[PDB]
């Protein structure tokens, strides 16, 4: 049974894209994650939508032990303002996402 | 840029699995189509997530128009009870897809 996660953050004013980099940076190559989007959003210049994908909730608890991902959170809460949207969901279909 | 859409819609009463088949049968192999994910949501059993990047809005534009996808569309439409949430978004970077 997978496992995602739909949010929505706002940065700081003019820190979108920093803090964008460091999410990419922070995502890669976690164990378990099938998949791993960041988006900017047209109506919002501070907006990010973050999107995710992985095989078990445990994959992404258990993601918080890598050091790159600690890293990017210490990096990167400076730079939240907000997080407007936090959803869990249970993917169960779909493409492209290996 | 690349494209992305975020949605939630709720299916009638009792109608979420039979929804969330017509979705993922309808948007087999579509050109272009990097993600294409549907969920469950745990908190609302009629609830559906459906989360999408594509290359281009173009690519978006041209599988949208295929037959079987709007056959989907409209297959899909007498189960579905509102259509809640729907975002457009630019995806800028990520892995797996």
């Known amino acids: 049974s997978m496992y995602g996660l739909i949010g929505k953050m706002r940065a700081t004013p003019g820190q979108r894209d920093a803090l964008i980099a460091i999410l990419v940076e922070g995502a890669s190559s976690m164990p ?18 973050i999107t995710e994908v992985w095989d078990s909730p445990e994959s992404h608890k258990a993601s918080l032990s890598l050091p790159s991902v600690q890293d990017a959170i210490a990096c990167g809460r400076p730079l939240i303002a907000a997080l407007d949207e936090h959803h ?11």
Do not use: F, M, N, R
């Not at 378990?32 to 939508?49: E, F, H, M, N, R």
């Not at 869990?88 to 290996?98: K, L, R, S, Y």
């Open 32 to 49: 378990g994650c099938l998949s791993y989007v960041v988006a900017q959003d047209p109506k919002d210049p501070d907006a990010i939508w």
């Open 88 to 98: 869990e969901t249970v993917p169960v279909g779909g493409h492209g996402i290996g």
